[PDB]
Amino acid sequence: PFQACLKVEKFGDLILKATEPQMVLFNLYDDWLKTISSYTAFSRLILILRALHVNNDRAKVILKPDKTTITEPHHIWPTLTDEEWIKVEVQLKDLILADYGKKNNVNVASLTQSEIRDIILGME
Amino acid sequence: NLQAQEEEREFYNARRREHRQRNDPGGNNKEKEVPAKEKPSFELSGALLEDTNTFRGVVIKYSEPKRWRLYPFKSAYLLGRHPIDHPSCSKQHAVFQYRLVEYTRADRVKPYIIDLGSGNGTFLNNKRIEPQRYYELKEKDVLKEIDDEDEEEEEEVSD
Amino acid sequence: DLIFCRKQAGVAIGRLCEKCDGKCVICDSYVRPCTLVRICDECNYGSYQGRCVICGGPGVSDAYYCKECTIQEKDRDGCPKIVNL
Amino acid sequence: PGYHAPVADPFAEHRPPKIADREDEYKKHRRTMIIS
Amino acid sequence: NPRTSNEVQYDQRLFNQSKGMDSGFAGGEDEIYNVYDQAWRGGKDMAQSIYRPSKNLDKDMYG
Amino acid sequence: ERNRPLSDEELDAMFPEGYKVLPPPAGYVPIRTPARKLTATPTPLGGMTGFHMQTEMKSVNDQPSGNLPFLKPDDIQYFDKLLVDVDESEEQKERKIMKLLLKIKNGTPPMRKAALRQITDKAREFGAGPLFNQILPLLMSPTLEDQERHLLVKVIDRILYKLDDLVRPYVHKILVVIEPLLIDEDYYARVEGREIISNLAKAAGLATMISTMRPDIDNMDEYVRNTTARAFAVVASALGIPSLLPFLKAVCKSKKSWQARHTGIKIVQQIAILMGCAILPHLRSLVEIIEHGLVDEQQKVRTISALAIAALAEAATPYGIESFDSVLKPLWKGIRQHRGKGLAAFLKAIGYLIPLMDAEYANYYTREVMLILIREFQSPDEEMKKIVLKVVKQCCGTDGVEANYIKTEILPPFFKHFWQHRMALDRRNYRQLVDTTVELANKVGAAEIISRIVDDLKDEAEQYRKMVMETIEKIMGNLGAADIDHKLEEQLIDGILYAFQEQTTEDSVMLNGFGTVVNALGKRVKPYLPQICGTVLWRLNNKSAKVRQQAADLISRTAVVMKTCQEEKLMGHLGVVLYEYLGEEYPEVLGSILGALKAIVNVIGMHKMTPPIKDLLPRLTPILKNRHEKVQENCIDLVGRIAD
Amino acid sequence: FRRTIYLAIQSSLDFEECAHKLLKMEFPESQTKELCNMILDCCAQQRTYEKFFGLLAGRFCMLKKEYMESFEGIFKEQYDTIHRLETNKLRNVAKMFAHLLYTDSWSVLECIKLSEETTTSSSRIFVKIFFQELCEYMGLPKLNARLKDETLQPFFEDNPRNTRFAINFFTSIGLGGLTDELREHLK
Amino acid sequence: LKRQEAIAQNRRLTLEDLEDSWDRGIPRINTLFQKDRHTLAYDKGWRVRTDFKQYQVLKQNPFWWTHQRHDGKLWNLNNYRTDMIQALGGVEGILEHTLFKGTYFPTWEGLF
Amino acid sequence: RLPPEVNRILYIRNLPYKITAEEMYDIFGKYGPIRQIRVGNTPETRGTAYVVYEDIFDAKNACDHLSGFNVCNRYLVVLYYNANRAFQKMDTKKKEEQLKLLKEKYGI
Amino acid sequence: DTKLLILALERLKEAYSVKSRLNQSQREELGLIEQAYDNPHEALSRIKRHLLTQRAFKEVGIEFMDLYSHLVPVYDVEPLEKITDAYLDQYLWYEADKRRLFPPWIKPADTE
Amino acid sequence: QRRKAEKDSERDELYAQWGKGLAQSRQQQQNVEDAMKEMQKPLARYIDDEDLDRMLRERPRYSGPAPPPNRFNIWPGYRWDGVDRSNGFEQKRFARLASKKAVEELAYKWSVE
Amino acid sequence: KLINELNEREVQLGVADKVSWHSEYKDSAWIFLGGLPYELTEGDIICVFSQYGEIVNINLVRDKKTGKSKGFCFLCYEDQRSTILAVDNFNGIKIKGRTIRVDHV
Ligand SMILES: [Zn+2]
Ligand SMILES: [Zn+2]
Ligand SMILES: [Zn+2]
């Protein structure tokens, strides 16, 4: 879901405000690579994008739970700790799976681990 | 259309509540949160028995001005008729619960007298106080409302 | 403290657990399993179905008598399911 | 110090690891039984 | 009858956190290590299991 | 209560022999009388204590002689007589020498042994009187240990193998302490207690026991009544039912008060539990006793009565149906009109009865019970749920019941109300639930039950997962996996792996569960292997001591399945991979590893071993030093298989 | 740049060495705001007050005229976060500015105000400490001087009410020996 | 002061009002809340016994001056490790010197 | 707020053979009125005594403060005395007269 | 008493805390101290019995720890007398501090 | 029969909404407000106004004494008796959970050796 | 009485929260207090059980004719966590000599 990445306020605003064709850079991992591996940060990324793609604002509820949670200007996503990251990850997996099963009328406690991994990661 | 239902309800205290929560009978005047004995408050004052503050009692039989005994107050004491009441009194006018004397903490360890609403009352310096409020006592003050067979005085230990 | 019940021997097959599995009951020996154990359902019933004849665990096998106790004909007495006293 | 004294059993930890009381309030009437 | 005590004293959540007595840390042996109080990462720190699935909480809180 | 004032005869009642009452003055006595008034008065008066600095004989007693192993600070009260060293001047010397008890209680194990024998052979000498006089206080001690208790129980046994006619005066004086052993949390304590009361009753006379134990029947406290009932159970096992019958049959008809009849009926019950299968001959007379309590005006008597019928029938497993005969018609009637616990009790009785009836009469009667059984699923009472549970087992596990009727009426409410996280956390409810569900599977078939409970393998809590897991285990154990379709089988294998991947404790249930599932599926499992064994290797690392042993054992039990389907690469894997762990320093792991190797040897043969034996065996040889157990076990086993 | 600063500072004993290490590197100057912003944040964020991180900020000022300016700015930048910062780090700050201001890296204060109108209970504590430290050095007499020549107003006035808040508040701090003249003014 | 305010409020103090100073002070205030605190209240002269342990025991104690049970832990080096890894170039750069890519582990986040 | 095992009776030991009941009554008389006190006059029990008070909490404050308390050169052994044990030396009887009295006087 | 005995026993256990296979005498010491945990009142009575009676003890081993400058004496006692003496020490310091024996100017002090 | 069947039925609304947990329902309500925040505040960071005042401050209810801590931190009602009546499982449950936290750390200390 | 032993198997085994059997319900405030003393009344039990919450409405079962309590009450709080707290806490309590029982509904 690289498309939903432009649902973020910053990107869409930037593009809509842009007066000339121009190349811009960003780091979607922020400072994550300090505490984690690349690929794992990649999984966290896919979780975030997909989750923004399904319920949108509700994923923003997960990502902006407490007003005491802040995001720094250098970074795309709020500053969180590893415990906090595992929790919000579980919540995002919950968003994606719940809505998929709600569309396909499937009891989503009955899906497999392979099925869940597929659904989250992409097309099965 | 006199009494629609014969029972209805209450929303009221139960005798076993107040009973079990205070028993010597059940008593009144549960100590407030402040109450603390006077000796340990003389320990936080850093005072050995020489310079410590101890309240001694003095008795005078109201008809004849001395000691039947002398009484230390050193957190509270139950002044009553005699068995339940700790500070028993032979006075026949005292209700089964007459009054209480509680040392409390304000700003300091200070003595306090509180009437329980004894039917006759109680006189302070031959001047009564109304029921249901803590009234600080100062040294040399006197206790006996009008039924008074006795007198009492308070003294701090000094000299 | 521990002795035989010696109730009449029925048609029910004996059941030994993991521990007791190989032992011939009376001779306490592992040698020459030949004949088969019988105890009364009075001794073997219910929670005792497939119970050990000894310790009280689930029977994983069936006890076989030795040839020693065979010729001395001890296997024909009362049901040799040990009862604690 | 008096403040740390205001801040003022392990044998009863290890010793209680030996045996136990084990029992309820219903059973303790045992203690009230006089001999015959 | 309230249950009252002089002063207030202290709560509970903390009033029993750290071990007891225990004593320092060996005579002062070299072999001990023990310099750091917490582990490096949250891999084993963060949870007993990194992954558990379910929608139980999901389809319950969902509505 | 215990603070009630006392009298001088009552005062002379407590303390033992040889003490004097003193007045010092009449005046100090008047101080003691004013003391009450002065406990208030002189506490409110001048007082204090101080000390002066001055320079400074110290007597004391442990138990000296030669050795005398140590005395706890309390036990002094008992053993004080031993402390004084006055010696060598009759009975007082027998009590004095009887402190060998102290050697039994506290000391080294050898002192306890030798002491125990020495007091055994002195039984006939000292007599039961002095012993029990010096024992029963100890076994009555409030501070008593576990071990010390058990040991005093031992000495009571060993001395009661000898003394026979002697104990007659002390029988009650014994039982009062011993009856609390019958009701206890410890099991071994209970079997001991039953044993020593057996030895006592058989040791004493019948009339001794009977005439002894009457006044405890009407005793105010129900505790003594209950434990006394179990006592009569034990003594009745000793001296047989028919000898004691007329006593009972006299008791249950006592017209004084109900409490008695309640006791006697409870006695009938505990006889039912204890004697069990052996009740059979006198079943008729027993029933004829108990029947008159079902109609009694008091409630308890009715409840405990019908309960006792239950216990009977449960030990009556099928026989003697007509002996219960006259009991039925009231019971069924009561089934209509009752609210509360008594109802459930009746359901318990009837429940154990139904397997004993004829499938025709029990057809009708059963079909009547099913209604109330349905309606009553929902009660919050856990006693209720136990009863109605076991009931559903017996009623619906009847050969004369139709599947479809259960499938419709029962299963949906059954899995609704009964399968919840209140149940599984409890023990008995756990087991009984397992059994009942197993039997429902035994009738309606497999795919139904399993198919409904599979989704719960993935539930959060352990104990619940453990429950459904062992349930699936027993089910697929009995019915066989043949009934299972395809998709539900995918949910199966995934469920079992998933549940197996999170193990908080080490236990067999998950493992035996998996093994039974696979061995039952046969070669329908083949498409699932690579997922299995992938999990098996990755788990085969993880964090060591917890899961290595478990994944290893998983291999061990999955060997044959990994063989017959002819996946040889997998045997290469397990062969050399497991071969590599033989250097593991943790014994509890290594043992499981060797076990896995063993199981792999029993499937693939000698000359086909991917780790050729030339490699393997000498690599095994040095391990024999390994001390800790499991290693030695599995190791020696494998050296045995290959060496043979 | 932000990471290099930290490593250079965590490496060096003394406060002297970090500046030498830092200047030596010859990192770009304009950043000479944020760098110093780095030092103020890096230790203040650091758990407890330490003498080192406060000295460093100051020297870095005497060496170049701008560095001083860079600091005074950063002190301003506090207003926004006077409320916001949590109530430990105020314990590092109050003193930590105390040590720039006792040693002359005072009138920059004046910007700070006493009002129930707008002062953050945060800010309340912040300034509170700041005096209970700086006092402990100058000893409340030299402080008498520095104030008496200061002309600090938003602190020291109109607003007899705010003179109760002021003077009272310095009875609360406890110093309240530089509140005299204002007491007279009340009268 | 936190004790006095708690007294006047009659409400006892929680953890949070002490979260500020939790690790601070020479007695290391948190040491009041040690579970075994009773026992330690009856220990005296510990500091000198540590001085004379050098004679009773062969090994040489550098920490002789203090004891964590009475005085708490007077330092926390947890930062030093993080800053150390940062100065070396982060986790990955360090691993580039190792066999790690040999072990074929997916990640280092689970290295134990 | 009391342990159940403690009773109004206290066994007291480490007494001299000369000791006077005057000292006994005086000392022990602090905590409450004496129900009574016994003292072993017999060869083994000499040096031991039993104290009984009108109230238990009396004895509780006693063993509290009197724990290991001193007399002469000695630190007395202060324990809460047991129950039951040797009792039946006396009997249960003589209830009939008193119960007949309470059934007579108050009529209940 | 239990408090004191516990403290002293922990102190003794602290020398061996790293615990390699040690040796025979040390083994006796661990087993005997371990014994003291299970049956404390026994140990206390035995100790007080020693303190009231025995005036003759066994021989103490001696060895020198080498600081490369000045050697440090090191003494070795049989475990029994070590537990006895240890409790004696915790007790002495406890009573001492309670009674304010040592004036403040003696400062290898617990406070600081 | 309209008003009567709406007495019983609108009582099904009343006691239905009351049944669960009136306290629980309001907390759920707050989340609904949160959705409103999302529509205007798609990805809020820092100084944006709600955060501003947010960090710009840092129906009888029971008065007397204090209410012992409750895992869920709920002040007792208006007229509450003012006395602790409990099995103490909260504290011990409260204390034990805390003890484990100490246990995880002293578990670790083990690992380096 | 069985409750407290279920909470001990729940704490001993390390159940860790949401799998708790108070999550059995999630739908229900009303609690069941049985084995209550007959002298008790509305205002009383309200005053004791408003400790752990705010009780909205309680119907105590009192026999219709005689107009005295049958000995138990169904209560309703404003908050569920008050119910979880109350069942898990206030149970096994002494009142007037008799130990009350509580549980969900
Ligand atoms: Zn048999
Ligand atoms: Zn066996
Ligand atoms: Zn044989």
Numbering used by the authors:
A (entry chain A): 1892 to 2015
B (entry chain X): 171 to 194, 209 to 249, 257 to 265, 279 to 286, 293 to 317, 323 to 359, 378 to 379, 383 to 395
C (entry chain 6): 7 to 91
D (entry chain 1): 82 to 89, 102 to 129
E (entry chain R): 402 to 464
F (entry chain 1): 394 to 449, 453 to 485, 490 to 1044
G (entry chain V): 455 to 559, 562 to 613, 619 to 648
H (entry chain A): 1391 to 1502
Quote the paper.
Pre-mRNA splicing is executed by a dynamic ribonucleoprotein complex known as the spliceosome. RNP remodeling of the B complex by the RNA-dependent ATPase/helicase Brr2 results in the dissociation of U1 and U4 snRNPs and the recruitment of about 20 protein components, forming the activated spliceosome (Bact complex). Conversion of the Bact complex into the catalytically activated B* complex by the ATPase/helicase Prp2 allows the branching reaction to occur, generating a 5′-exon and an intron lariat-3′-exon intermediate. In this manuscript, we report the cryo-EM structures of the human Bact complex in three distinct compositional and conformational states at resolutions of 4.9, 5.1, and 6.5 Å.
The final model of the human mature Bact complex contains 15 479 amino acids from 52 proteins and 414 nucleotides from three snRNAs and the pre-mRNA, with a combined molecular weight of about 1.8 mega-Daltons. The overall appearance of the human mature Bact complex closely resembles that of the S. cerevisiae Bact complex. First, the splicing factor Prp17 and the NTR proteins RBM22 and G10 (Bud31 in yeast) are fully loaded in the mature and late Bact complexes, but not in the early Bact complex. Perhaps most importantly, the Switch loop in Prp8 of the mature and late Bact complexes is positioned identically as that in the C or C* complex and interacts with the splicing factor SRm300 (Cwc21 in yeast). Careful examination reveals that, compared to the early Bact complex, the EM density for these two splicing factors is already weakened in the mature Bact complex. For example, in the mature Bact complex, the RNaseH-like domain of Prp8 interacts with the endonuclease-like domain, which directly binds to NY-CO-10. The RNaseH-like domain also associates with Bud13 of the RES complex. In the second step, the remaining NTC and NTR proteins, together with the NTD of SF3a66, the splicing factors SRm300 and Prp17 and the PPI CypE, are recruited, forming the mature Bact complex. One notable difference is the helix II of the U2/U6 duplex, which is bent by about 40° in the human Bact complex relative to that in yeast. Another marked difference is an extra turn of the U6/intron duplex in the human Bact complex beyond the U6/5′SS duplex, which results in the separation of the downstream human intron sequences away from those in S. cerevisiae by up to 40 Å.
